[PDB]
Amino acid sequence: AFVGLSDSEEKLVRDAWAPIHGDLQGTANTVFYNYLKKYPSNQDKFETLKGHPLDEVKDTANFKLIAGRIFTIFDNCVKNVGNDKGFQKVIADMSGPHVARPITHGSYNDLRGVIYDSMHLDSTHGAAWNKMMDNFFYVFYECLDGRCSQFS
Numbered sequence: 513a514f515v516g517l518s519d520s521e522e523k524l525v526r527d528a529w530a531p532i533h534g535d536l537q538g539t540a541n542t543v544f545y546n547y548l549k550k551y552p553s554n555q556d557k558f559e560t561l562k563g564h565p566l567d568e569v570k571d572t573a574n575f576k577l578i579a580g581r582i583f584t585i586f587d588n589c590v591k592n593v594g595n596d597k598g599f600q601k602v603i604a605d606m607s608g609p610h611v612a613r614p615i616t617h618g619s620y621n622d623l624r625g626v627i628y629d630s631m632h633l634d635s636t637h638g639a640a641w642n643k644m645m646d647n648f649f650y651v652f653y654e655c656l657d658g659r660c661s662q663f664s
């Protein structure tokens with residue numbers, strides 16, 4: 513279920529994200545590369561990337577746009593961490609494009625983990641981060657299952 517963060521937890525999440533927020537596209541490019549490299553089945557889900565070597569596409573506009581759009585959503589979730597409705601709406605809106613798609617919970621959860629590992633959080637910040645991401649996935653998976661109206 514959705515579990516709100518305290519004011520102090522919100523501050524923890526903002527602080528946890530601040531290095532990435534400060535280098536959003538550069539972090540996005542690195543994290544997205546590492547994700548595709550570690551979990552190579554996923555590149556095929558991106559039709560603009562499909563059929564080419566990862567090292568050939570990593571420097572391209574198409575690739576950087578995708579990595580950017582993922583990170584922009586998380587950046588906006590963070591921005592909305594103190595507003596449950598606003599946070600839910602960010603996710604609600606990005607969920608539609610995903611509903612019809614052959615992407616497993618495993619694939620999304622593998623991306624969450626690459627992000628986690630890149631942030632190297634202490635346990636206090638990590639706990640607050642994981643409250644937010646647990647909310648993220650709760651909302652996202654509810655919308656993938658066609659129960660996205662409940663957040664409206």
Ligand code: HEM
Nearest residue numbers: 554557558559581582583585586606609613615619620623
């Ligand atoms: C969980 C965090 C994610 C976020 C915040 C996110 C965000 C977005 C956004 C903003 C779009 C743009 C809407 C569009 O033009 O379709 C999009 C599209 C899309 N995403 Fe995601 N995404 C996430 C995870 C994933 C994963 C893990 C995959 C594949 C394994 C994936 C595959 C796709 C595909 C295939 C599209 C449709 C557009 C296209 O053909 O590239 N997404 N996503």
Ligand SMILES: [Cl-]
Nearest residue numbers: 551552553554
């Ligand atoms: Cl894989």
Ligand SMILES: [Cl-]
Nearest residue numbers: 564565566567
């Ligand atoms: Cl490859």
Ligand SMILES: [Cl-]
Nearest residue numbers: 578579581582
């Ligand atoms: Cl994406």
Ligand SMILES: [Cl-]
Nearest residue numbers: 594595596598
């Ligand atoms: Cl607010």
Ligand SMILES: [Cl-]
Nearest residue numbers: 632633634637
């Ligand atoms: Cl930390």
